[PDB]
């Protein structure tokens, strides 16, 4: 049922990974088919949601309801390998815009929404690969919205249009994540 540590798996079909710092109290629910929760009361770092694993680009459609008082991310994520990228197609977020002091590339539309595209290098840093260097990709939707579809093909189509590398996918989620601050989601993915 409701965890607090990390842990990923399987879950009525998704793929899904909870993975905590450890600071504050986080806990995740899975629920039924795509749905999961998490609620965070003064976190540290966390990420969890539902989705595939590995990935192929799907369309990803979601639901649901996200909240904070401070910074947190809603968003289509996650990493690929050879090279190794995290990437993050963000829907909405709270007090804080990670694509802050990042590269901007340029603009891509889909989904009915316009998305500014930013690149920034993670040096050393924890991954899916233990510690590691790679890029970070980010299409930040220039308004924010919980809920919608999210053709992830069109992301990572425009990505590579501008320049930059992609590798195979790993896994894909609908990722809430939240930093040094409280709130909820409950997202349904499908």
């Given at each position: ?50 989705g595939?694993?590995?990935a ?22 996650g ?92 896994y894909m ?18």
């Amino acid at each position: 049922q409701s965890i607090t540590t990390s842990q990923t798996g399987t879950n009525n079909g998704y793929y899904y990974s909870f993975w905590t710092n450890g600071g504050g109290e986080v806990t995740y629910t899975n629920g039924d088919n795509g749905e999961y929760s998490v609620t965070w009361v003064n976190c540290g770092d966390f990420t969890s949601g539902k989705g595939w694993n590995p990935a192929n680009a799907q369309t990803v459609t979601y639901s649901g309801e996200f909240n904070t008082s401070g910074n947190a991310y809603l968003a289509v994520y996650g990493w690929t390998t050879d090279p190794l990228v995290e990437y993050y197609i963000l829907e909405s977020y709270g007090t804080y815009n990670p694509s802050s002091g990042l590269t901007l590339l340029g603009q891509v539309t889909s989904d009915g929404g316009t998305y500014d595209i930013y690149s920034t290098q993670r040096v050393d840093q924890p991954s899916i690969e233990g510690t590691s260097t790679f890029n970070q990709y980010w299409s930040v939707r220039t308004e924010k919205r919980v809920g919608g579809t999210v053709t992830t093909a069109n992301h990572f189509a425009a990505w590579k249009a501008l320049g930059l590398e992609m590798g195979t996918y790993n896994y894909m989620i609908v990722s809430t994540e939240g930093y040094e601050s409280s709130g909820s989601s409950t997202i349904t993915v499908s």
